[PDB]
Design a protein around this ligand. Structure first.
Ligand SMILES: Nc1nc2c(ncn2[C@@H]2O[C@H](COP(=O)(O)OP(=O)(O)O)[C@@H](O)[C@H]2O)c(=O)[nH]1
Ligand SMILES: Nc1nc2c(ncn2[C@@H]2O[C@H](COP(=O)(O)OP(=O)(O)O)[C@@H](O)[C@H]2O)c(=O)[nH]1
Ligand code: ALF
Ligand code: ALF
Ligand SMILES: [Mg+2]
Ligand SMILES: [Mg+2]
Ligand SMILES: [N+]
Ligand SMILES: [N+]
Lengths: 168, 161
């Protein structure tokens, strides 16, 4: 059961690290090498009983080999079918918070009704204030997938935003 | 719930192809490049009502690529914890059917008593008679993960076993 949250963004942003933080398990390989993840990885999790599918994808860039090209094509296929996208941003590589200043082509390609949460990762390095805010109507979260600081704010956000109804 | 079936073997054996055949979707990326799969891939399926976790792994070898090396260590970790291993052999690379001939080091490393099914893949290229047999007490299945021929025999085997 549960809605689909897709984690997407540039290589090395910390997407698999976030998947692992959310799954509470080393589900995905994490290294400092861009293009570590190629296959789509999915974890089914629960937050206070609410089921949720978390989907980790290949970092989006010009592909360095055929496998990574296919992983990126599949990433877009998952984004297109997502219920929400977590746009993961390496906070050390940009100071911009509005995703139109970060990567407008990414934002523009997203399906019309698809909600996006901007996740500024690596707050442990940048020293940004942890937690939730808003920018141009998008949820904005600052956290560290590596240390786990601020990931509870994301969990609460997913709890509050990814709900659905059901019966027998 | 459901038992854990781990598909394991050399690179390019057709492990991800078999995952995709069993899962009925393009769950894993398939190419002719050794070391395509590195992360462990898991698909929960039901076969005629029976729940199974089918687990696809990095082809086993001494890899140079750091990520493939990690995937191979993780493949061994899955094998260690499996309820059955499907040992996939590329039928085009050997006529041998006994896994002791094919790759004794692999068979010897498996947990004591972990059941192993030898799967001779690429029967569409070799012309081998599809279906189930046995070798030295091991189940042996000849099939083509690409065309799907003989995969029904594997499905029935998993249900039975
Ligand atoms: N300092 C710090 N490093 C991080 C954080 N999140 C990820 N990393 C590192 O960034 C690199 C890439 O992480 P990974 O999860 O593989 O990125 P992906 O390619 O987007 O999946 C790895 O060296 C991670 O350990 C973080 O919050 N803080
Ligand atoms: N002709 C034929 N090719 C196959 C079959 N199964 C896999 N292949 C090919 O073998 C290559 C490796 O397949 P793949 O599933 O990625 O191998 P893996 O590394 O073991 O996962 C690919 O080019 C596949 O299309 C088969 O049954 N018949
Ligand atoms: F660069 Al990656 F998963 F390794 F997006
Ligand atoms: F060589 Al592979 F999955 F690509 F075992
Ligand atoms: Mg990754
Ligand atoms: Mg594979
Ligand atoms: N990475
Ligand atoms: N492959």
């Amino acid at each position: 059961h549960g809605m689909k949250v897709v984690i997407a963004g540039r290589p090395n942003a910390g997407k698999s690290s976030l998947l692992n933080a959310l799954a509470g398990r080393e589900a995905a390989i994490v290294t400092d090498i861009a293009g570590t993840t190629r296959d789509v990885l999915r974890e089914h999790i629960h937050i206070d009983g609410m089921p949720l599918h978390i989907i980790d994808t290949a970092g989006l860039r010009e592909a360095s080999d055929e496998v990574e090209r296919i992983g990126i094509e599949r990433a877009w296929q998952e984004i297109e079918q997502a219920d929400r996208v977590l746009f993961m941003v390496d906070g050390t590589t940009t100071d911009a918070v509005d995703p139109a200043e970060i990567w407008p082509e990414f934002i523009a390609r997203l399906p019309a009704k698809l909600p996006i949460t901007v996740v500024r990762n690596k707050a442990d390095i940048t020293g940004e204030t942890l937690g939730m805010s808003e920018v141009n109507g998008h949820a904005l979260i600052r956290l560290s997938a590596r240390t786990g600081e601020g990931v509870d704010v994301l969990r609460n956000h997913l709890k509050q935003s990814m709900g659905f109804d059901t019966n027998m």
